[PDB]
């Protein structure tokens, strides 16, 4: 029904919000050599997935880390330097985060139009019978 559109579009609104927050944590950790949890932060990605289970909502199935190797930088005098003297920094790519930031915002706003479009159809469907 038209109410299923609200569930489908609403799921995308939450879905694009997850990717926006993941990108925000990527931009804020692009230069963080250290990290609690004994893990040099690596770029995270939200992998969307259609949950077919007509109406196909979108669900986040889990956040996946980047496969790119960490950026090694020779800083011998740093306390975190290894024997060779290289400290490692996250593999966050700025350009893809900016592209993800644009795409997530554009996709978020176009889901609002569909919810608005379905809202008007239900209101007119209610005016029938009056």
């Amino acid at each position: 029904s038209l109410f299923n559109v609200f569930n489908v579009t609403g799921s995308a609104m939450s879905a694009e919000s997850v990717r926006l927050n993941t990108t925000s944590s990527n931009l804020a950790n692009a230069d963080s050599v250290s990290s609690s949890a004994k893990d040099t932060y690596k770029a995270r990605h939200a992998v969307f997935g259609a949950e077919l289970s007509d109406t196909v909502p979108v669900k986040v199935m889990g956040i996946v880390e980047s496969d790119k190797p960490l950026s090694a930088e020779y800083n011998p005098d740093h306390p975190l330097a290894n024997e060779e003297g290289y400290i490692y920094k996250p593999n966050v790519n700025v350009m893809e985060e900016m592209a993800n930031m644009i795409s997530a915002s554009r996709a978020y706003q176009t889901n609002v139009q569909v919810a608005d479009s379905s809202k008007q159809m239900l209101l007119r469907t209610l005016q029938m019978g009056q």
Partner: protein
């Protein structure tokens, strides 16, 4: 090919965790020592080197790992989800849980001790070893197990998950509850 000393350096973080995800490495040098966690997920590695030492946890989810040789020291947990391990060797010093879900595992060492949780979910294992001791939660859901040994020890909850147990242990002390 095989991982070298210089190739090892390019897959290590600041605190010393080796990341080999999707990397085309087939075998690791013997007497290998890792400062932190080890990740060999999705790797074509079929065998772990003898004398392997991991300062953190071993991650081999959805990998081709098949054989682990005895004497391996793992400080953290062992996660072999979706791998090709068929048997667990005797004498593995495991400092954490052992997750063997969705593996072709068939045999387990006798009187095995798991300092954390144990998973045999959806495994073709036919029977648990005698004298098994589990300090965490035991999940046997979807497996082929239907008879427990004479004596076993589980300090947490026992989850049947759907499989039918007919012969319960004679000597069993449970710190939690049993769930179907």
């Amino acid at each position: 090919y095989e991982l070298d000393y210089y190739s090892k350096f390019g897959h290590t973080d600041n605190y010393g965790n080796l990341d080999l995800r999707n990397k085309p490495y087939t075998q690791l040098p013997s007497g290998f020592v890792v400062k932190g966690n080890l990740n060999i997920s999705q790797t074509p590695i079929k065998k772990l080197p003898k004398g392997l030492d991991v300062g953190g946890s071993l991650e081999a989810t959805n990998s081709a790992l098949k054989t682990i040789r005895s004497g391996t020291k793992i400080k953290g947990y062992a996660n072999l989800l979706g791998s090709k391990i068929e048997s667990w060797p005797r004498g593995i010093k495991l400092g954490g849980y052992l997750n063997l879900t969705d593996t072709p595992l068939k045999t387990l060492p006798a009187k095995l001790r798991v300092k954390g949780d144990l998973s045999v979910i959806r495994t073709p294992i036919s029977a648990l070893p005698e004298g098994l001791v589990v300090d965490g939660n035991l999940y046997i859901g979807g497996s082929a197990l239907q008879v427990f040994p004479d004596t076993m020890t589980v300090k947490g909850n026992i989850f049947l998950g759907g499989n039918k147990i007919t012969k319960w242990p004679s000597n069993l002390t449970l710190g939690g509850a049993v769930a179907p």
